């Protein structure tokens, strides 16, 4: 049947939740409350989406995030525990509440890591990425604050929705060729940081960010230069590669040589040549955790809504239907 809801005001916001969610306490992320889930005995996070149907773009953003979260059924990716609305009908349908595990510990919050803990943490990012990538989805904003890590170094990829530090150079140069390996660049930047204890490319702006990248990875080779249409774009990328060249051996002095080999395959300017998540999992660096029988891919994900231009009401109707058809994961 439909649960009993109860109403309170917090941080001058009206919350209306099923009575199984008790002891709501605001945290930090927009409108988010820690809550005790009386059904399981476990603490969860309840998020009330802000102005979910305000515009076409918010409405599609609401739909997008619900469709994505409902799809994610993987150890190393945030899962959706519950979604609800107070509305008894599409007529009254206005607010959308998502329930997740309580994270409140990101990759920075947890780092001074041994080689073994870098292996396990980068292993879990790549296992999660393999999954997300297999369903034709790109994170685009992988960075330490978007990685939940509990006491036992267990890692989930999520998106709380400085980015430029972990951002692939092709995106900041506005190159044509984009692929899922923009996420691998990011993983390379995260791994480098876990090894050295400092941001690899702490640019103050996108031009500084690119100059710092090119100092390490080098000016484009003949092969890459071949794929760039514009003389002014080929001049400019060569323009930004004038800081005295650096070498990977020196930057990662004292790292496991296998880590350094894997970094050199991730931090490749030519995204056509960048190692994929599935290939990185098979690299010797992860021999202690790699199991080809336990690195699963995602079920097919229907992205055919991403290309659509629809009215607010259509986005809201599709969203309502996804709330109603939601089936909780097992206890
Ligand atoms: C527009 C949009 C579209 C899609 C996404 N999207 N994409 C992905 C993938 C699958 C593609 C990666 C995952 C997501 N979104 C999330 O991940 C996400 C959604 C909802 C929630 C709700 N919980 C929380 O906010 C939460 C839980 N612990 N804490 C916490 C507790 C104490 C202190 C600090 C924090 C929170 N603030 C959380 C996350 C995001 C945005």
Q: Does 98 contact ligand 1 (Cβ within 6 A)?
A: yes
Site to substitute for ligand 1 among 78, 163, 303, most atoms within 8 A of C-beta: 78
Using a 10 angstrom Cβ sphere, with 0-12 exposed, 13-18 middle and 19 or more buried, the burial of residue 31 is middle
* N- to C-terminal Cα separation, the chain: 19
User: Which of 75, 73, 190, 182 has the alpha carbon at shortest distance from 127?
Assistant: 75
Strand partners, 35: 44
Nearest ligand 1 atom to alpha carbon 29: 37
The tokens of 121 are what? 């943490």
78 lines ligand 1 (CB under 6 A): yes
Contact assessment for residue 167 and residue 186, using Cβ atoms and an 8 Å cutoff: yes
User: Cα 95 to the chain's mean position, in Å?
Assistant: 25
45 within ligand 1 shell (Cβ under 6 A)? yes
Output the six-digit token pair for 17.
């939740």
Burial (Cβ within 10 Å: 0-12, 13-18, ≥19) of residue 191: buried
Q: Is there a contact between 202 and 166 (Cβ–Cβ < 8 Å)?
A: no
List the beta bridge partners of residue 8. Answer: 15
Sign of the Cα torsion 155, 200, 139, 264 reads negative
Which residue CA neighbors atom 39 of ligand 1 most closely? 160
How many other C-beta atoms lie within 10 A of the C-beta of residue 26? Answer: 13
Cβ-based neighbour number of residue 18 at 10 Å: 19
Q: Take residue 290 and report the two structure tokens written for it.
A: 């790699």
Of the candidates 155, 143, 138, 129, the residue with the CA atom closest to the CA atom of residue 281: 129
Is position 159 annotated as part of the catalytic site? yes
Q: Take residue 84 and report the two structure tokens written for it.
A: 């609800």
Are 73 and 66 contacting, i.e. CB atoms less than 8 angstroms apart?
A: no
Residue nearest to atom 37 of ligand 1 (CA): 29
How far apart (Å, rounded) are the C-alpha atoms in residues 122 and 283?
12
Q: Are the C-beta atoms of residues 266 and 277 closer than 8 Å to each other?
A: no
Q: Which of 150, 93, 39 is nearest to 324 (CA)?
A: 93
Q: Which of 234, 236, 181, 185 is nearest to 213 (CA)?
A: 185
CA 222 to chain centre: 33
The Cα 86–Cα 138 span in angstroms is 32
How far apart CA 24 and CA 45 sit, in angstroms, is 9
Q: Tell how far the Cα of 107 is from the centroid of ligand 1, in angstroms.
A: 15
Q: Return d(Cα 323, Cα 80) in angstroms, integer.
A: 12
Q: What are phi and psi of 261, to 5 degrees?
A: -60, -45
Three-state SS string across the chain, please? CCCCEEEEEECCEEEEEECCEEEEEECCCCCEEEEEECCCCEEEEEEECCCCCCCHHHHHHHHHHHHHHHHCCCCCECCCCEEECCCCCCCCCCCCEEEEECCCCEHHHHCCCCHHHHHHHHHHHHHHHHHHHHCCCCCCCCCHHHEEECCCCCEEECCCCCHHHHCCHHHHHCCCCCCCCHHHHHHHHHHHHHHHCCCCCCCCCHHHHHHHHHHHHCCCCHHHHCCCCCHHHHHHHHHCCCCCCCCHHHHCCCCCHHHHHHHHHHCCCCCCCCCCHHHHCCCHHHCCCCCCCCCCCCCCCCCCCCCCCCCHHHHHHHHHHHHHHCCCCCC
> Given phi > 0 = left and psi -120 to 50 = alpha, else beta, which region is 274?
beta
Distance CA 188, CA 182 (A): 10
Q: Is the separation of the CB atoms in 74 and 296 below 8 Å?
A: yes
- CA 148 to ligand 1: nearest atom: 28
Work out whether strand 97-101 and strand 155-157 pair parallel, antiparallel, or are unpaired.
unpaired
**CB of 67 shorter than 6 A to ligand 1:** no
The set of residues, in sequence order, having a beta carbon less than 8 Å from that of 189 and lying 6+ positions away, is: 165, 166, 199, 200, 201, 267
Quickly count: other Cβ atoms within 10 Å of residue 140's Cβ.
15
What residue numbers bound the domain in which 280 lies?
Answer: 107-286
Whole-angstrom Cα distance, residue 83 to residue 286?
36
Do β-strands 147-149 and 155-157 pair in parallel, antiparallel, or remain unpaired? antiparallel
Dist CA 60 CA 28 (whole Å): 26
CA atoms within 13 A on the CB side of 97: 20
Chain centre to alpha carbon of residue 15: 27
CB of 80 closer than 6 angstroms to any ligand 1 atom: no
Resolution in angstrom units: 2.1
Name residue 16's beta-bridge partners: 7
Of 163, 137, 126, 2, residue with least CA distance to 64: 137
- Ligand 1 atom at minimal distance to the Cα of residue 146: 17
* Method of structure determination: X-ray
Distance separating alpha carbons of residues 46 and 101, to the nearest angstrom: 9
| 130 close to ligand 1 (CB < 6 Angstrom) | no
Distance CA 295, CA 286 (A): 13
C-alpha 132: how far from chain center = 9
Q: Which residues contact 52 (CB under 8 A, 6 or more apart)?
A: 58, 59, 62, 94, 95, 96, 319
Report the binding-site residues for ATP: 27-32, 47
Cβ 119 vs Cβ 285: under 8 Å: yes
The whole-angstrom separation of Cα 134 and Cα 278 is 9
CATH number of 234's domain: 1.10.510.10
**Residue length of the chain:** 331
């Amino acid at each position: 049947e439909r649960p009993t809801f109860y109403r309170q005001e917090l941080n001058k916001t009206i919350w209306e939740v099923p009575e199984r969610y008790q002891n709501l306490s605001p945290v930090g992320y927009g409108s988010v409350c820690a809550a005790f889930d009386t059904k399981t005995g476990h603490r969860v996070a309840v998020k009330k989406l802000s102005r979910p149907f305000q515009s076409i773009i918010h409405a599609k953003r609401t739909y997008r995030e619900l469709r994505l979260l409902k799809h994610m059924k993987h150890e190393n990716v945030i899962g959706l525990l519950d979604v609800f609305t107070p509305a008894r009908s599409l007529e009254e349908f206005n607010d959308v509440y998502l329930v997740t595990h309580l994270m409140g510990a990101d990759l920075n919050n947890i780092v001074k890591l041994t080689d073994d803990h870098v292996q396990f943490l980068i292993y879990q990012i790549l296992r999660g990425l393999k999954y997300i990538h297999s369903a034709d989805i790109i994170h685009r904003d992988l960075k330490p604050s978007n990685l939940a890590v509990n006491e036992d170094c267990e890692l989930k990829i999520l998106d709380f929705g400085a980015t430029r530090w972990y951002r692939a150079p092709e995106i900041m140069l506005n190159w044509m060729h984009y692929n899922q390996t923009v996420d691998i660049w990011s993983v390379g930047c995260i791994m480098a940081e876990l090894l050295t204890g400092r941001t690899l490319f702490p640019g103050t702006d996108h031009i500084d960010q690119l100059k710092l990248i090119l100092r390490l990875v080098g000016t484009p080779g003949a092969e890459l230069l071949k794929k760039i249409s514009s003389e002014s774009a080929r001049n400019y990328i060569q323009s930004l590669a004038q800081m005295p060249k650096m070498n990977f051996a020196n930057v990662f002095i004292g790292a496991n040589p296998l880590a350094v080999d894997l970094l050199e395959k991730m931090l490749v300017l030519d995204s056509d040549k960048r190692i994929t998540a599935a290939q990185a999992l098979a690299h010797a660096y992860f021999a202690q955790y790699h199991d080809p029988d336990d690195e699963p891919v995602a079920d097919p994900y229907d992205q055919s809504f991403e290309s659509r231009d629809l009215l607010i009401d259509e986005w809201k109707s599709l969203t309502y239907d996804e709330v109603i058809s939601f089936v909780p994961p097992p206890l």
